[PDB]
Design a binder for this molecule. Structure first.
Ligand SMILES: O=C(O[C@@H]1Cc2c(O)cc(O)cc2O[C@@H]1c1cc(O)c(O)c(O)c1)c1cc(O)c(O)c(O)c1
Ligand SMILES: O=C(O[C@@H]1Cc2c(O)cc(O)cc2O[C@@H]1c1cc(O)c(O)c(O)c1)c1cc(O)c(O)c(O)c1
Lengths: 815, 815
């Protein structure tokens, strides 16, 4: 479009810059793609543009890394099993100020750059929140000029591609590397050995881990550009490779696949613990290879290990990389021959742990038999850690035997296990939750004993989202009308959005905020037609719940509300209601029967609602297939209403909530996770808060939750349960939803019925405000204006000052 | 070196060409390798040079392929399971005239280009002769301006890397793609489906192959540059990929490995038949993907199929791609719905078959049960082919029932099999052997019945070697002293080497030929020290036997001779003998116990000979480890004597014989394969011919070979057998060589003892001529001078005119 090149926030199309970009595009098309414009497909054109844009990172990537070598600042290592990065082309162009120059260059070559962007595969190397947080954090650490390295696994297959067939989830391999990855640089020369199995012999010098099987770890380095500060940091992802040397010769060559299977695929369980050996191998693989890099980089700097914590921070994203603690002790004691006590002092000052959930089924509790087989030295070191840790508990709390049993790294039972969260707290100088309410819940419930031993360890770091991906990239319309009033500094100083409260009565801004949402809604609706032949009413309220499918997130409560709207229309057909397009999307874990049945119930409700001629365009319900970072960038800027309806106490933070607030949706939600802080920043008068508070949930748990009480007292609820139970939503198979009905009536841990009436009444308040466009938009302005706290720059600046001990900086390197 | 830049055959170092090469080298080092000269290793420098040289292919590669589209000449498809390509960097620089310019460019950057060349991995995608012939053929077809495409498999692992440990072969995976392949272009956009298993339903339109498992075939295209004619042809290698859509989700993602195992590794059996299902899958994979390309390319040209043979030749390199015949019939009949008879007329005019051995254990005879399971439609079509073929035999030879049984594609027995050689002859308009004697042996023995039915089918095409790789690349010294007298035209017109017979009495040339061999011997000896701490006497005769280890090649006869020289020294220590360095190298098939014992016997003989202080530097025996194309380019130009000592009738052609003749070694050999034609070209007076002729072997077979007769009549032979038997060469394990002794005495199919006395006497004639340097060199001149027939340009020109029906051309395209 002509209009989009006019957007100032997208930078300058310098005449020489355009000329060079076209020359380099054509050069890559010829020498890199080995095509000419005769045979070139849109995919060749995307790749020619990606190689051209990637060439602009290289000088800064080399200069940044040389700068870290020269200045020797403290290095931050962000260890994660997941980096939900999404696409790279737009992000690179935004962060290097090339967006308008590439748009003009490709326009002059007769190409639509927006069409080329849609060709790129997501780097879908995460499940959801925790993975996307890692991605926002790498972006913020680069923008803040930290010497920061993401370390993870280069999965051959990311989070599965979700197809919906017959209204059911089907899973397909996410072959994201099919056409190559133009961003990464293979570093086979920096390949490192990782050891498994074997046994411990305790010799003269001490212990020795021998008779191991070797898997090599080959690093692939991806650039991470800061926002217009010429900083380019590194994400290093390890790929598994069979060792050089060794059924027959042929079978031995094919058996190289077993070692290489370690980096084959992301576990799609959204943090729910499965105890798979292959998952333990992935966790050890990332930790072992990463810590060898850290130790090597430390020794080749301006061996004595007292300075190690002054030069190294290791941030553990959940317990997934918790083996970092025993592995660093193994390296320091067995290989560097430090005394246990010195090694432990170093380890604890180096390591910090971030907890992302209180849900007990998320907790990693590895069988000791599995650890003894796979990692015999690690289990010895863990027992030693536990003995010395519990000695300290006994000394602080003499005779508190119950506290010793509760705090032990070792869990007794049929199967003896190691609690990896207890290991993380024992081995870390800082433990943080990811929202104020969550960090308090840690100190009062699941880590109370640890808090009483070492209160100074416990911190809060409220999550955030990068305002580059989550406003400038995905919503350039909104970024522009904001820049037109307060300039561009807010893009890396998001608290400046508070200036927008000066505009709540400004006729032009009220007009502009509503026009941007309408433009976003027209574009998203076009898509739902062009690529899925699905019609949506563009004058309807876009009611959006997008996140992984879990009972705790209560997609089912949204289902009860949708059926309530259908049933109220059928009862009073002549009564006006605010038209709604209810959009639910998200992946279910491939096992999880209940999650898959919930997806089927959403599509089944659609089958009835969407074909009822009495309803027509007044209510539509659509399951958004294959929800992922790229789709989030499309639907979130188009949303009117943000569904954040987890049972109070279950969602640690959320980050999708923050994306919606930044992009001009109003929120309906419980007082859970960061929804509490979002309501506080904006004022509760500007949020649709409903339902039980954490205290209310605890009171119900104390007397026992009886779903029958709610069914017996709420006629509209009885009608819906009777429709699901009798087969109104599955006439060819009347018993289809019996398991959902049985769970809701008898085994509902997330108290869906207890929030049903407050939810429905809150949703009437949403409709009532939507009927007043001007007042809807003024409340939106009050939300966008107060979304600044939820920048990951704020979050990372807190990690840097309160945990890592490094001072952030927005000052530019040269180019 | 300063001297090597002076070599005119290596071309011009133009000042602007040098300037541009350095600029492009530095550009690739920065943008492609993402390094600077601070951290760059020799391997980064090799890759920067390879990308720079590869950029020079691209325009010509695109223009050549556009030219074939424009002119629509008949296309030649060379189908092979093997392309033994070796390294590409030097070959590319020679064929584009860039060698001196890159040498000067890298010299000016402070680098040694020869050192960078040694970093490149061989593309070791073959076993030996047949694979290397495919590689010489692609080079010759490009040099002759044919519209020719090599089609094969992109094996992840080529021919195993051979280590020698304890004097034994050990096999390691040839991870040739570890650091990437800068030559190939991945073409994932041109990926094609290949079908396996399933069943045939015979419907209204006719047969339909349904319920199949799909494996995708992803092509990788490698450039094949002609010699200074601006032609760049394509080698397309298929890689196996799991189909996009589908133990659990995780196991299903890991199970993608089973389909991908099809292209994992080259079968290392040097043509010996094993009947492995995975090998049958590889053969079908290459044929099915290739024939879809051929059919598509045919339909998109200037559907009617009568012109198909005028636009397509398919050359079958051995029976490995024999399924091309039933697959083309399947496509034409089942998918294009041609009548059987029209389809068959097309298939036979399209297909031709090259036979590479008479040894019955090489013959592919697939169980019908395996074909019925894997390829049910192919087996139906093969039976139909057989019925109609045998109908024709019955009509030509009425009542010859024995001939029907002998000629059938179907072999009866405990296990019913398909004879793939019989299928190839039935389905091909031409059948060729690879040397005059071999092609006659085919018409008189194993294909006599087929010859009597269709004599016009049977041709000879004597093998050849490319004089680019096998003289200009590997022996620039020799190429230069030749160019100094007759100019450069001989490099693509090798018959011009006959001009050198004018120089047999030229003092300067005699001096120069001997100086080049000495320079080659000094360089090879340096290597045997620098990279293996092995000392060799540079004034010794370099006696070289390099080829795959097989009983038929009689490395054991060479062993008997070496022990004879040792025993004669010990008996008369004071008697002068011509010092020898006896070098034997080659890979044994990983199964093949006897081949592995023969390697151990060579190293064991070395252990005694090389440490006997009475022998000292008068006799040394070394096993050259990991013999492969790159090592052949080093040892062959250094050789004095070429060992070509196969039992008469067993070696179809040989090509290593031709390499040695071209590079100034004299030959000791039997009248076998192309040794016969080499002796004819040079004159037998200029070859060390010995032993039984084919007629002599047949006479022995008629009365029965009794090794005992030879043992009883030859004292020197008895002494050696008694040394092997008693444990003289294995004192710590006296019975080590009992199996070799038992085979030689009782089960020797290759009549080693029958050629022993003539071999030893012939070797005395070699020593006697070596004592006269001037006469040795004059006989070398007479060999090099007559080596011109053995150019693969001569061979390919015969294929083009006598089988493919296309006229070759050495005329230049524009650049
Ligand atoms: O459906 C349209 O886009 C799709 C939806 C969409 C969105 O909701 C937000 C966003 O950030 C990008 C976005 O890209 C989508 C898209 C898909 C394509 O296949 C494509 O070629 C393209 O240009 C784009 C569309 C229709 C239009 O009529 C149009 O003019 C346009 O620019 C775009
Ligand atoms: O051993 C030397 O080379 C090795 C043997 C050899 C050969 O026999 C023929 C040939 O075509 C090339 C060839 O490359 C070998 C080689 C190996 C290396 O590791 C290397 O760095 C190199 O420059 C080369 C050598 C010694 C020398 O003293 C010397 O000056 C030289 O140029 C080379």
């Amino acid at each position: 479009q002509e209009k989009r090149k006019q957007i100032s926030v997208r930078g300058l199309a310098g005449v020489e810059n355009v000329t060079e970009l076209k020359k380099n595009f054509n050069r890559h098309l010829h020498f890199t793609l080995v095509k000419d414009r005769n045979v070139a497909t849109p995919r060749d054109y995307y790749f020619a543009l990606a190689h051209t844009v990637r060439d602009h990172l290289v000088g800064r990537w080399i200069r940044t890394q040389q700068h870290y070598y020269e200045k020797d600042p403290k290095r931050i290592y962000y260890l994660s099993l997941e980096f939900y990065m999404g696409r790279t082309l737009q992000n690179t162009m935004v962060n290097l100020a090339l967006e308008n120059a590439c748009d003009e260059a490709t326009y002059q070559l007769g190409l639509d750059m927006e069409e080329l962007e849609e060709i790129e595969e997501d780097a879908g190397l995460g499940n959801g929140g925790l993975g996307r947080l890692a991605a926002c954090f790498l972006d913020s650490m680069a923008t803040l000029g930290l010497a920061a390295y993401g370390y993870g696994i280069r999965y051959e297959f990311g989070i599965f591609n979700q197809k919906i067939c017959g209204g059911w989830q089907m899973e397909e391999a996410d072959d994201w590397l099919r056409y190559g990855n133009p961003w990464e640089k293979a570093r086979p020369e920096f390949t490192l050995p990782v050891h498994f199995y074997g046994r411990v012999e305790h010799t003269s010098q001490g212990a020795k881990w021998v008779d191991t099987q070797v898997v090599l770890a080959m690093p692939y380095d991806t650039p991470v550009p800061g926002y217009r500060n010429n900083v380019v940091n590194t994400m290093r992802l390890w790929s598994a490779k069979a060792p050089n040397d060794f059924g027959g010769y042929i079978q031995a060559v094919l058996d190289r696949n077993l070692a290489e299977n370690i980096s084959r695929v992301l576990y799609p369980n959204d943090n729910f613990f499965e105890g798979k050996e292959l998952r333990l191998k992935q966790e050890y693989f990332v930790v072992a290879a990463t810590l060898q890099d850290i130790i090597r980089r430390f020794k080749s700097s301006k061996t004595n290990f007292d300075a190690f914590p002054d030069k190294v921070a290791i941030q553990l994203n959940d317990t997934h990389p918790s083996l970092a603690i025993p592995e660093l002790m193994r390296v320091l004691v067995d290989l560097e021959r430090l005394d246990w006590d010195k090694a432990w002092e170093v380890t604890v000052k180096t390591c910090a742990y971030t907890n992302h959930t209180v849900i007990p089924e998320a907790l990693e509790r590895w069988p000791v038999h599995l650890l003894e087989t796979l990692l015999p030295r690690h289990l010895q070191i863990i027992y030693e850690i536990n003995q010395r840790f519990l000695n300290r508990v006994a000394a602080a709390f003499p005779g508190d035997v119950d506290r010793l049993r509760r705090m032990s790294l070792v869990e007794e039972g049929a199967v003896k296990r190691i609690n990896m969260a207890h290991l993380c707290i024992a081995g870390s100088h800082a433990v943080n939750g990811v929202a104020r309410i969550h960090s308090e819940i840690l100190k009062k419930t699941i880590f109370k004993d640890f808090y009483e031993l070492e209160p100074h360890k416990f911190q809060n770091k409220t999550n955030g989202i990068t305002p580059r991906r989550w406003l400038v990239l995905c919503n350039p319309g909104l970024a522009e009308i904001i820049a037109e009033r307060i300039g561009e500094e807010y893009i890396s100083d998001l608290d400046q959005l508070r200036k927008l409260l000066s505009y709540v009565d400004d006729e032009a801004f009220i007009r502009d905020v509503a026009k941007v949402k309408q433009e976003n809604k027209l574009k998203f609706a076009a898509y739902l037609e062009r690529e899925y032949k699905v019609h949506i009413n563009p004058n309807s309220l876009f009611d959006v719940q997008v996140k992984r499918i879990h009972e705790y997130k209560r997609q089912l409560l949204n289902c009860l509300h949708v059926i309530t709207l259908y049933n109220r229309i059928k009862k009073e057909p002549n009564k006006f209601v605010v038209p709604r397009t209810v959009m639910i999307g998200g992946k279910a874990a491939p096992g999880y029967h209940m999650a898959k049945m919930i997806i089927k119930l959403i599509t089944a409700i659609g089958d009835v609602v969407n074909h009822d001629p009495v309803v027509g365009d007044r209510l539509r319900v659509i399951f958004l297939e294959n929800y992922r970072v790229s789709l989030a960038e499309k639907v979130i800027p188009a949303a009117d209403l943000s569904e954040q309806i987890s049972t109070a106490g279950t969602e640690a933070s959320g980050t999708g909530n923050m994306k919606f607030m930044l992009n001009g949706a109003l929120t309906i939600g419980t007082m859970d996770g960061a929804n509490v802080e979002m309501a506080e920043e904006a004022g509760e008068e500007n949020f649709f808060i409903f339902g039980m508070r954490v205290e209310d949930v605890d009171r119900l748990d104390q007397r026992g939750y009886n779903a029958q009480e709610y069914y017996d007292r709420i006629p509209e609820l009885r009608q819906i349960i009777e429709q699901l139970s009798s087969g109104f939503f599955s006439p060819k198979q009347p018993d289809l939803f019996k398991d959902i009905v049985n769970m809701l009536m008898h085994h509902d841990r997330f108290k869906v019925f207890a929030d049903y009436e407050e939810y429905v009444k809150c949703q009437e308040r949403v409709s009532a405000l939507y009927k007043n466009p001007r007042e809807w938009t003024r409340m939106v302005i009050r939300n966008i204006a107060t979304s600044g706290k939820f920048s990951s720059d704020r979050t990372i600046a807190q990690y840097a000052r309160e945990i890592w001990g490094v001072e952030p900086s927005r000052q530019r390197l040269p180019a």
